[PDB]
Design a protein around this ligand. Structure first.
Ligand SMILES: [K+]
Lengths: 80, 85, 105, 106, 35, 135, 125, 80
RNA sequence: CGCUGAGGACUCUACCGAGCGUGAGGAAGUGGAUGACGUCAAAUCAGCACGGCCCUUACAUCCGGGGCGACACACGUGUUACAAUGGGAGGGACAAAGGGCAGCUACCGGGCGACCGGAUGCGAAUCUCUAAACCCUUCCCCAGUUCGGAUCGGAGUCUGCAACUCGACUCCGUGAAGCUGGAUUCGCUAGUAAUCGCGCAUCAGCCAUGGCGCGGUG
RNA sequence: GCGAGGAACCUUACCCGGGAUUGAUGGUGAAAACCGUAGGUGC
């Protein structure tokens, strides 16, 4: 009758703080850090014709897993 | 811009949503019956535009805006999670 | 010699059969396999029976040589005289498979 | 970020909804935005805020062209302090748009 | 205009007789490039 | 940069020659060409010598001495590089069935003291001796 | 017993387990001559043993993942050199004299925007 | 070409007009904009004025035209 | 399988090159981002705003069919080739990043194939999409060829209401110019050039040989 | 191989015509639509 908790967010400090709060709040396995999912967006710097000059933006998703035996905005939970 | 284009897009979306008969005909053969439907009811006439400026090019499905609008909000810190590399 | 065509006598079957108008590499391989002749045999090494088998497979199918030439000419004449878009493109000498001119022939 | 909600792979609708006075999902002097909007409103009603900010370490106030109704466009720096919060405001005067960019380093 | 002349020779003048003022400028450039 | 010993002979000159010979990063192909060429060399001039010794003697024969920048001395590294490049280039230019055969023919000719690479070296020597006054 | 070591080269990773024996080098549950059917690759892998004269004295089990054949062979060579150093610390100067223990950090450069490749540029004209 | 499982694509209204003319037995000219409609054996013997963008090019359908689209006989571009 | 339990791999925390030079011992900087003040009345009123001016029986607005894809030609940027360091046939081996809900599809059955029909798992470190250059054996033996694959004919498969103008892919047939290219001209300096394949954005489908990334050999 | 990182219709601004304002079943029709039961991608 174990419980699986999956936490996703876009700020690593936020995920770590939320996981620590959930752990502190009588047998819970350590938070397993799943591989981070990163996306890169390349956009044109200029609104008109300048193809060479480009800007790069990043969006990261951090995932933690909690196995329990025996919420700040921006964090999605998958309690099951 | 050209608000008539946005009105056209909204009308096309409404006509496409108003769907089940087309799905049933496609599941069957019934191509002669599919010929009878209005052309604006077909989903191929739906074109993705920026949700605020109506720009028909440089679309981004993840955020629903053009590249220029995306760059503006990413620099302004309005899209959560997105940061400059 | 085979269908009125003299083949290269020193070439393998699966290559030398492509010298007939109407047979390529794929058709040559298929013809040899259906006739039961190994494809890596030189033309000069074909037995009389094997040559007969190849000729009989060429017949009854595989419109080749003068028949194919006449068929292609008839198709082109019909296309031109029907006065379709492709017909006028062939009559005037321009690409008709969607290719764009002003840059290439 | 001015928006705080997890919206992975589904940002669009929520972004559109979020887009749809001294104003700065589950001390007006040292505030950049209020300074810029106050300057813009004063310019509508017809820069030297640099002294008002300066316990600010530094403050820069750039004002764009079409100044004072002149035909040409001119940009001025109005640097002060030891500049090494950024706000942008737009004023709709009788001759067009004026851009006021305020940098404040505290 | 712009002469090919291996290395470029570009000039531009704005007037009603640009086709002649540009030629004057380019004559100056060609003489200076002679030696 | 570091140079790996040759797998067969344990030499760096062999690896450098293969590096000059290689196209588009196909070092296995270049090695196969070189080893094959050595095989025809040893099968043809079979000479009270070795297979690699003939190749080394050919490189030494077609190496140049001075180079007109006015004539001046040549560094050993540039000497070796230009010798290898000349051998490979004239082997490519000359006719033949396979690259291994062409290279073997050119190596044998260079050892036997005549060939296009030797003609190039002799011409460079003549052009060098032409300007002895300005030196 | 077992001596553990790891080598890395480009995208290749080699984990080497070394033990007493004679000559069995087994890669991914395959013989060395069957996994690397090239004299150059076999020589690259078995280089440090031939340098230190330790060949015909060990069994090696190798787990390779990632990269191509040359990267994998170089990673295996590095892992074997590190394992030999762990087994006997007095052979470190001999292995350093050939560079078998230096980690080569060369990796594929990222492609840059506005360019066809990492450094190659478009034809300006 | 068109998949054989869907059959041929023929404009239903235009075909209905053609069969109505066939049943009547009269002769006239049928004005159409259906350039993509395939020519069927029922079309033979009639005159169909096909739109090309700014005029109606008249086509007299013969047996060799069966299987061709109506737009192949009404060119849209003028060159000289 | 029970387990691994930290040898890798994941994330998150702490670190590590210290010099007139050399030097030993030790694993031993590069790429990108950020551009003070000046210049081009440089580019964008068709991304978005915005002063002025000009349109209301029309420069506003809905629809169908055309066009943006035409070709005497010229210029620019690329992709294939002109072959032996190569082209076919058969077999063996090695990646990384990234994508996936009407989507990727295990596994069966049909078709030469593009694909189709049942069925399974997966909103996914769990289930799926991912190699080629390379190696081995063999043929072609210097030819406009077993090089090249443009053009054209036929038959199909998908998407879509619809593939004529004007789609992609598949299977037959046909098989052109091209024998390494003058004056001139461009890029790059190490995991780089060169070469090989893989993935993504937009996207019903796709003219994707373009753009943005990844690894292999080097 | 620049806006364009997806022009068959749509996109689409351009052209030719068919309409409409000045902001439930039938018949006809290519559709829009018809008949009965502010805005401007204009300067
Ligand atoms: K579309």
């Amino acid at each position: 009758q174990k419980i699986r908790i999956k936490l996703k967010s876009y700020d690593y400090m936020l995920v770590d703080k939320s996981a620590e709060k959930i752990v502190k709040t009588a047998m819970v396995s350590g938070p397993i850090p799943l591989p981070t999912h990163k996306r890169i967006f390349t956009v044109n710097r200029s609104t008109f014709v300048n193809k060479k000059s480009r800007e790069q933006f990043e969006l990261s998703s951090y995932k933690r897993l909690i196995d329990i035996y025996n919420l700040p905005s921006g964090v999605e939970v998958e309690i099951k | 811009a050209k608000e008539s284009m946005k009105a056209r897009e909204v009308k096309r979306a409404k006509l496409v949503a108003k769907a089940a008969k087309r799905a049933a005909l496609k599941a069957e053969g019934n191509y002669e019956a599919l010929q009878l439907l209005p052309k604006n009811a077909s989903p191929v006439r739906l074109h993705n535009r920026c949700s605020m400026t109506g720009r028909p090019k440089g679309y981004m499905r993840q955020f629903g805006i053009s590249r220029i609008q995306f760059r503006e909000m990413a620099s302004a810190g309005l899209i959560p999670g997105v940061k400059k590399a | 010699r085979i269908v009125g065509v003299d083949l290269p006598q020193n070439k393998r079957g699966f290559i030398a059969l492509t010298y007939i108008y109407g047979i390529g590499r794929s058709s040559a391989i298929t013809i040899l396999d259906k006739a039961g002749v190994d494809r890596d045999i030189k033309v000069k090494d074909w037995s009389d029976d094997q040559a007969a088998a190849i000729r009989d497979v060429i017949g009854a199918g595989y419109k080749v040589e003068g028949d194919l030439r006449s068929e292609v000419q008839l198709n082109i004449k019909r296309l031109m005289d029907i006065g379709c878009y492709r017909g006028i493109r062939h009559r005037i000498g321009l690409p008709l498979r969607g290719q764009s001119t002003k840059n290439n022939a | 970020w001015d928006s705080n909600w997890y919206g992975g792979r589904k940002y669009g609708e929520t972004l559109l909804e979020d887009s749809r006075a001294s104003v700065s999902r589950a001390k007006p002097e040292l505030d950049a935005a209020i300074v810029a909007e106050n300057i813009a409103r004063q310019l509508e009603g017809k820069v030297k805020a640099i002294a008002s900010a300066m316990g600010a370490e530094g403050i820069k106030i750039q004002v764009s062209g079409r100044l004072n109704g002149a035909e040409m466009a001119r940009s001025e720096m109005f640097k002060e302090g030891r500049t090494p919060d950024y706000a942008l405001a737009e004023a709709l005067t009788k001759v067009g748009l004026l851009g006021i960019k305020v940098w404040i380093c505290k | 205009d712009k002469d090919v002349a291996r290395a470029w020779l570009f000039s531009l003048m704005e007037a009603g007789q640009k086709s002649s003022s540009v030629q004057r400028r380019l004559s100056a450039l060609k003489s200076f490039y002679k030696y | 940069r570091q140079i790996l010993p040759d797998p067969v002979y344990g030499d760096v000159r062999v690896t450098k020659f293969v590096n000059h010979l290689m196209y588009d990063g196909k070092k296995n192909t270049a090695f196969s060409i070189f080893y094959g060429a050595l095989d025809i060399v040893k099968t043809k001039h079979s000479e009270e010598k070795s297979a690699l010794e003939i190749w080394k003697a050919a490189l030494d024969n077609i190496t140049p001495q001075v180079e007109v920048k006015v004539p001046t001395e040549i560094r050993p590294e540039r000497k070796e590089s230009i010798s290898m490049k000349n051998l490979i280039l004239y082997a490519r230019k000359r006719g033949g069935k396979t690259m291994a055969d062409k290279l073997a023919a050119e190596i044998v000719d260079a050892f036997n003291n005549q060939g296009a690479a030797f003609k190039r070296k002799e011409d460079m020597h003549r052009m060098a001796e032409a300007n002895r006054a300005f030196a | 017993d077992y001596i553990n070591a790891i080598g890395r080269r480009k995208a290749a990773v080699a984990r080497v387990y070394l033990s007493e024996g004679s000559g069995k080098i087994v890669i991914n549950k395959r013989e060395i001559e069957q996994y690397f059917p090239s004299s150059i690759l076999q020589y690259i892998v078995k280089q440090p043993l031939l340098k230190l004269d330790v060949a015909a004295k060990y069994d090696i089990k190798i787990n390779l993942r990632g990269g191509g054949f040359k990267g994998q062979s170089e990673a295996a060579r590095l892992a074997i050199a590190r394992a030999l150093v762990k087994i006997n610390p007095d052979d470190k100067p001999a292995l350093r004299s050939e560079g078998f223990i230096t980690r080569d950090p060369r990796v594929v450069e990222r492609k840059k925007p506005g360019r066809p490749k990492a450094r190659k540029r478009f034809q300006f004209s | 070409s068109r998949s054989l499982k869907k059959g041929p694509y023929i404009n239903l209204k235009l075909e209905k007009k053609v069969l109505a003319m066939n049943e009547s037995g009269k002769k006239a000219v049928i004005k159409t904009w259906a350039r993509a409609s395939m020519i069927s054996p029922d079309f033979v013997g009639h005159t169909i004025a096909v739109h090309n963008g700014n005029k109606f090019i008249p086509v007299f359908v013969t047996e060799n035209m069966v299987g061709h689209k109506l737009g192949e006989f009404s060119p849209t571009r003028t060159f000289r």
